Amino acid sequence: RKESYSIYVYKVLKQVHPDTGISSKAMGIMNSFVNDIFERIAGEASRLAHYNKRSTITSREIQTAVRLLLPGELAKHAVSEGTKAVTKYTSA
DNA sequence: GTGTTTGGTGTGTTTGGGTGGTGGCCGTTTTCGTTGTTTTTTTCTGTCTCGTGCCTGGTGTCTTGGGTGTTTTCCCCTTGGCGGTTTTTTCGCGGGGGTCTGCGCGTTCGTGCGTTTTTGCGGTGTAAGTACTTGAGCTTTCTGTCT
């Protein structure tokens, strides 16, 4: 039962485009994409942590990594989204 | 332009097989209290970067000469392109065989974690003779007494 991001990418698609489906080949592309972005961000956060002699990866490390990797408006909106989500989550 | 006339998008009906939706369940996310620590916080020292100031002259830079090398034009000679025909092998489906990749079960020895030992690496705890000083001995005078 080798695990994947499929259910979520289909949930998000159904939210943004209720009448649009997804081929298996394109679904594979999305899984690869998610995995790749995950590894870019986590790796940058790891480097940041090591440089500053810290042992925990917190939201600050992730935010900075996002700012370093995502170009322009992609970064600005991603940061907004991430901040909104961690705000909503802490205040439950 | 007028004109034919090969290429390409729009239209319709038909097929199917591949995506979406649902049932079953199990394994992974969580709800909880406790531990232990990696933060964060404040307060310290005191490094290093910013700021200014003066003087020198290496460098920048404005400008005249000019010449050469880039831009365009004319001509060519040729080598890719488009087409027709023949070749052939890529590819498709089916069948057969075997290797080797993955699960599971058993373990042993290899590494992490610890107390401990240690070298490098680095901080700094004799006999003389002269000059000077000091302590013992006795003067003046002045102040009190006293006939």
Side-chain angles (χ1 to χ4, degrees):
Chain A
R1 50 168 285 142
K2 299 176 187 179
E3 186 181 277
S4 70
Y5 287 110
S6 62
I7 299 301
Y8 313 107
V9 158
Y10 201 52
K11 287 244 282 161
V12 172
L13 174 60
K14 174 176 315 308
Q15 294 290 18
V16 72
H17 278 291
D19 65 346
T20 311
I22 186 62
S23 80
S24 47
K25 286 176 286 189
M27 191 74 198
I29 300 300
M30 288 310 148
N31 294 333
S32 299
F33 169 73
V34 180
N35 288 310
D36 185 66
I37 298 309
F38 183 96
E39 181 57 23
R40 294 189 206 200
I41 306 274
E44 198 74 40
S46 163
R47 288 185 280 273
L48 285 190
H50 301 162
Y51 294 159
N52 290 279
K53 297 308 148 212
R54 298 291 177 86
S55 81
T56 62
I57 283 178
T58 79
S59 50
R60 197 155 181 279
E61 286 69 30
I62 306 288
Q63 176 161 287
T64 305
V66 164
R67 278 194 64 213
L68 285 162
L69 284 145
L70 294 200
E73 307 302 301
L74 271 190
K76 296 177 189 174
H77 303 134
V79 158
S80 295
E81 295 281 51
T83 307
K84 177 187 174 187
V86 73
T87 300
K88 209 292 189 192
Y89 172 75
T90 192
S91 59

